[PDB]
């Protein structure tokens, strides 16, 4: 039951993840 | 499956399209035809809604 699928120290990798109305 | 089989027994390729819409935004929409652009004139514009 899938509803989506997508395919495309030295490093500071910052990220921000959020959900708004789905 | 033979060439002489009856129309009822002849092979048929079946493709069923089902469309599901859950409590999430819809990705698959139809095409959105666009008109030509005009510059240096007073127009009522609509860019991406």
UniProtKB/Swiss-Prot annotation, chain A:
Glycosylation sites: 1
Subunit-level organization: Binds to host ACE2. RBD also interacts with the N-linked glycan on 'Asn-90' of ACE2. Cleavage of S generates a polybasic C-terminal sequence on S1 that binds to host Neuropilin-1 (NRP1) and Neuropilin-2 (NRP2) receptors. Interacts with host integrin alpha-5/beta-1 (ITGA5:ITGB1) and with ACE2 in complex with integrin alpha-5/beta-1 (ITGA5:ITGB1). May interact via cytoplasmic c-terminus with M protein. May interact (via N-terminus) with host bilirubin and biliverdin, thereby preventing antibody binding to the SARS-CoV-2 spike NTD via an allosteric mechanism.
Record function comment: Attaches the virion to the cell membrane by interacting with host receptor, initiating the infection. The major receptor is host ACE2. When S2/S2' has been cleaved, binding to the receptor triggers direct fusion at the cell membrane. When S2/S2' has not been cleaved, binding to the receptor results in internalization of the virus by endocytosis using host TFRC and GRM2 and leading to fusion of the virion membrane with the host endosomal membrane. Alternatively, may use NRP1/NRP2 and integrin as entry receptors.
Name of the molecule in the record: Spike protein S1
Protein source organism: Severe acute respiratory syndrome coronavirus 2 (2019-nCoV)
Gene name per UniProt: S
């Amino acid at each position: 039951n899938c509803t989506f699928e997508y395919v495309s120290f030295k490093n500071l990798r910052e990220f921000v993840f959020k959900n708004i109305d789905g | 499956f033979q060439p002489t089989n009856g129309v009822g027994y002849q092979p048929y390729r079946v493709v069923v399209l089902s469309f599901e819409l859950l409590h999430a935004p819809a990705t698959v929409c139809g095409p959105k035809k666009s008109t030509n652009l005009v510059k240096n004139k007073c127009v009522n514009f609509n860019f991406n809604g």
